[PDB]
Structures are given as structure tokens and as C-alpha cells.
């Protein structure tokens, strides 16, 4: 599915994302916006290293989920990458939390550095009741 902005914001808040390991909801919204345009079914093959990015946060198969087809991969979220293509984003959210338990935190996503870091991201949650 493609989420509407405020629906997603409320969905993530219910799933405990607000302030998770120091990360505001608006940072998570900005990440989802630039990764996928709020689209849970998005996939992107990386020809360069044989991995794929999955779902609303574009979580990468090399480290985070298993797709069977990425060489030398591990599966730190202990999920099929299929779980990251559901309309229900609970698994994706669990896996995004796992990503940010690592030292880099939200910096793991380069899109976050480019489009969100050191920016005014308040617009992402304006009006959403979160
Ligand atoms: Cl911030
Ligand atoms: Cl699974
Ligand atoms: Cl679903």
C-alpha cells in the first residue's frame, strides 16, 4: 500500500517509533518519504552488490533480512525480506528498530543523511495528531 502522510505518522506512533533510541517520529517520516514515498511494496535491486532494498524503509538484504539470493548475506532482523513487503508494517518497524540498535543509528540509511539530517523536518508530522 501507499500510506497517506498522517495515517502513517499515527501508525508509527502506535508501533512505538516516537523517540525510539532518540529518533523523533518526524525523522522516521522523512526517512520513509525519501526511501519509498510511503510505499510498502517498493523494491530496488542494487546491481552493484547483488542486494535488494525492501519496503517502506528500503531495508537491505545484505545485512537485515533474508531473500536467499544475496551472497554472503546475513539476516539480523531474523525475517524473510517478504515480511517487509506487507501492507501491515509491524515487521518492518521491528526491523527498522533493530537497524538503529547498531552504532550508526538512523545514519545507516544514506537517504536520511541527504534529505533529513540537519534539516527542519517538522512538516512531516504537522496536523497528524501525533
Ligand atoms: Cl531531530
Ligand atoms: Cl518472515
Ligand atoms: Cl498485509
Distance between Cα 86 and ligand 3 center (Å): 4
Active-site residue, selected from the candidate residues 4, 18, 35, 87: 35
Resolution in A: 1.4
Domains of the chain with CATH codes = 1-130 (1.10.530.10)
SS3 annotation, 49-68? CCEEEECCCCEECCCCCECC
Tell me which method was used to determine the 3D structure: X-ray
Distance between Cα 90 and ligand 2 center (Å): 12
SS3 annotation, the chain? CECCHHHHHHHHHHCCCCCECCECHHHHHHHHHHHHCCECCCEEEECCCCEEEECCCCEECCCCCECCCCCCCCCCCCCEHHHHHCCCCHHHHHHHHHHHCCCCHHHHCHHHHHHCCCCCCHHHHCCCCC
Distance between Cα 23 and ligand 1 center (Å): 7
Would you call 53 a catalytic residue per the annotation? yes
Residue 95: partners with Cβ closer than 8 Å, 6 or more residues away: 57, 59, 64, 65, 77, 79, 83, 84
Distance between Cα 105 and ligand 1 center (Å): 13
| Dihedral of alpha carbons 93, 97, 98, 103, sign | positive
| HSE-up (13 A, CA, CB side) for residue 71 | 4
Residue 81 in contact with residue 52, Cβ under 8 Å? yes
| HSE-up (13 A, CA, CB side) for residue 105 | 10
Residue 56 in contact with residue 15, Cβ under 8 Å? no
Exposure letters 64-98 (e unless 16+ CB within 10 A, then b):
bbbbeebeebebebebebebbbeeebebbbebbbb
Complete edge-to-edge strand list for the sheet that includes strand 51-54: 43-46, 51-54, 59-60
Active-site residue, selected from the candidate residues 4, 7, 18, 53: 53
C-alpha gyration radius of the chain: 14
Residue 70 in contact with residue 103, Cβ under 8 Å? no
Amino acid at each position: 500500500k501507499v500510506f497517506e502522510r498522517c495515517e502513517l505518522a499515527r501508525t508509527l506512533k502506535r508501533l512505538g517509533m516516537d523517540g525510539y533510541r532518540g529518533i523523533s517520529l518526524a525523522n522516521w517520516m522523512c526517512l520513509a518519504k525519501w526511501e519509498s514515498g510511503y510505499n510498502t511494496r517498493a523494491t530496488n535491486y542494487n546491481a552493484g552488490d547483488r542486494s535488494t532494498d525492501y519496503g517502506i524503509f528500503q531495508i537491505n538484504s545484505r545485512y537485515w533480512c533474508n531473500d536467499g539470493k544475496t551472497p554472503g548475506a546475513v539476516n539480523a532482523c531474523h525475517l524473510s525480506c517478504s515480511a517487509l513487503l506487507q501492507d501491515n508494517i509491524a515487521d518492518a518497524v521491528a526491523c527498522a528498530k533493530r537497524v538503529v540498535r547498531d552504532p550508526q543509528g538512523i545514519r545507516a540509511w544514506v537517504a536520511w543523511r541527504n534529505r533529513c539530517q540537519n534539516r527542519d523536518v517538522r512538516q512531516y508530522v504537522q496536523g497528524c495528531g501525533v
